[PDB]
């Protein structure tokens, strides 16, 4: 009913390509600039001379207010810095970490993040190489090929294709005589600024089935950890609303994405991704 209502609302404005969606997105962008100017969303830490080299993109810095502060191996002169933010879940908890594609020299920091926050599942929405270009460092282990950074040793335990566009990697990670299972899901064919839809949903369901109970955040990244990252988080958020049955009467995608954007820069990056989101939500409902 809340669902059918949302659906009714979407159809009534011309669906996916309705003019009003552009206006909504334009408005989200406006609120974003406004936040920067008001300093509600700042990038002091990302801008520090010690941290600048840890950003893959010079124009994508984590917001100070929600940034992930690393304290593992702090005791030994490690920096607290990683280009990543927390995003709140439906229940107000820190349900997601949105972060960039690790660089060769941030690989260790990525794993510090995964260990410190007890992450069980990572969703990667990019590829190591896209068109040109290196877009994310391999931070997982390969079959006959541990990966070692600092005190961490990553081992590939198995890997299978969940489906045509999604790889599932089962990893063991070892740090200080301790092992933990970590599952990584990688979507192979999602272009940056763009959109995949069935398999993305299978990715989210799978992630949610591996995660189980437990308060630990999901780790969601792309190349910069904005566009494709935000889409993923938003989809999981809304699916979580849905599963609960807590879709309000006045349910607004504009307000969900707005809240995302508040917590990770460019969480949903393009109008085209914004439309796709509306559409995915429709489907999830129908």
């Amino acid at each position: 009913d809340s669902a059918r209502s949302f659906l009714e609302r979407l159809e009534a404005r011309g669906g996916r390509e309705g003019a009003v969606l552009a206006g909504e997105f334009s408005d989200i962008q406006a609120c974003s600039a406004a936040w920067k100017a008001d300093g509600v969303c700042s990038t002091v830490a990302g801008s520090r001379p010690e941290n600048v080299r840890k950003n893959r993109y010079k124009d994508v810095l984590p917001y100070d207010q929600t940034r992930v502060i690393l304290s593992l191996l702090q005791e030994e002169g490690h920096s607290d810095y990683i280009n990543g933010n927390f995003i709140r879940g439906v229940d107000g908890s820190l349900a997601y970490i949105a972060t960039q594609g690790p660089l060769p020299h941030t690989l260790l920091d990525f794993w510090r993040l995964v260990w410190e926050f007890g992450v069980k599942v990572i969703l990667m929405a990019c590829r190591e190489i896209e068109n040109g270009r290196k877009r994310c460092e391999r931070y997982w282990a390969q079959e006959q090929e541990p990966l070692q950074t600092g005190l961490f040793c990553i081992t590939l335990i198995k890997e299978k294709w969940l489906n045509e566009d999604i790889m599932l990697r089962t990893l063991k990670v070892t740090f200080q005589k301790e092992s933990r299972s970590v599952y990584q899901l990688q979507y192979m064919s999602w272009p940056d600024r763009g959109v995949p839809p069935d398999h993305m949903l299978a990715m989210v369901e799978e992630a949610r089935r591996l995660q189980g109970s437990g308060p630990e955040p999901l780790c969601v990244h792309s190349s910069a950890g904005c566009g494709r990252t935000g889409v993923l988080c938003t989809v999981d958020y809304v699916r979580q609303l849905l599963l609960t049955q807590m879709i309000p009467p006045d349910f607004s995608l504009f307000d969900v994405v707005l809240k995302m954007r508040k917590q990770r820069p460019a969480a949903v990056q393009t109008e085209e991704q914004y439309r796709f989101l509306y559409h995915t939500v429709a489907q999830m409902f129908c």
Partner: peptide
């Protein structure tokens, strides 16, 4: 490189 442009 910049990611947004």
């Amino acid at each position: 490189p910049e990611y947004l442009t």
